[PDB]
C-alpha cells in the first residue's frame, strides 16, 4: 500500500526540505563573527573535502554497479568486520555481563 498522499506527512517533510536548503545561508550570514577564518590556503586544501566526496560517489557508484553482475561472492574478513560492527558489541556485550553477573552470584552472594 504505497501511498504518500497525506497532508500530515507532506507538510512535515516539506518544512525540513525547505529548511535543509536555505537554513545554512541564513544562519551563517547573521551570527556575529567570533573567530578569524583561514581564507587563504593551497588549492589542494581549499577543495580537498569536495574531491574526496566526489571520489566517494565515483567509487561508490562503480562498486554498486558491480553488484548486478552474475558473479559469485567471497566471504571477506574485512567485510564481516564491518557488518558485525567490529565485534565490539558481540564481545563486550557477552564478556562484561558474564564476568559481572558471575561474580555477583558465585562470589558476592553465595
Amino acid at each position: 500500500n504505497i501511498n504518500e498522499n497525506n497532508p500530515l506527512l507532506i507538510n512535515s517533510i516539506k518544512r525540513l526540505l525547505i529548511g535543509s536548503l536555505f537554513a545554512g545561508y541564513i544562519i551563517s550570514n547573521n551570527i556575529p563573527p567570533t573567530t578569524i577564518p583561514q581564507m587563504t590556503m593551497p588549492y589542494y586544501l581549499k577543495t580537498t573535502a569536495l574531491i574526496v566526496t566526489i571520489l566517494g560517489f565515483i567509487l561508490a557508484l562503480e562498486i554498486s554497479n558491480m553488484t548486478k553482475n552474475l558473479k559469485y561472492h567471497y566471504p571477506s574478513n574485512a567485510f564481516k568486520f564491518s557488518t558485525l560492527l567490529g565485534y565490539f558489541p558481540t564481545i563486550m556485550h557477552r564478556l562484561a555481563p558474564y564476568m559481572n553477573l558471575s561474580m555477583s552470584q558465585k562470589s558476592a552472594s553465595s
Binding site: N3, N6, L8, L9, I10, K14, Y25, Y43, T47, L50
Partner: protein, 71 residues
C-alpha cells in the same frame, strides 16, 4: 495511516499517483538546482578560492632581509 486522499492498492502493479503529489516533488528539486547555480555564480570563491595563495619561492632576499653570504 488514516486521512488524506485515499488510493486503492494495486496487485503486482505500479501504484497510483496524483497531480498534486508529483508536481510538488518536481518543484522542490528544481528549486534546489536553481539555488546551487545562483549561489555558485555570486559566490564562486566560496567553493573555488578566496584569494590567490602566494608562492614563497619567488620572494627576494632584500624584501626578506637576508644578508649576503659574504656578510
Amino acid at each position: 495511516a488514516g486521512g488524506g486522499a485515499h488510493i486503492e492498492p494495486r496487485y503486482r502493479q505500479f501504484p497510483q499517483l496524483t497531480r498534486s503529489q508529483v508536481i510538488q516533488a518536481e518543484f522542490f528539486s528544481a528549486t534546489m538546482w536553481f539555488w546551487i547555480l545562483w549561489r555558485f555564480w555570486h559566490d564562486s570563491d566560496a567553493v573555488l578560492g578566496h584569494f590567490p595563495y602566494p608562492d614563497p619561492s619567488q620572494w627576494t632576499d632584500e624584501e626578506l632581509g637576508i644578508p649576503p653570504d659574504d656578510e
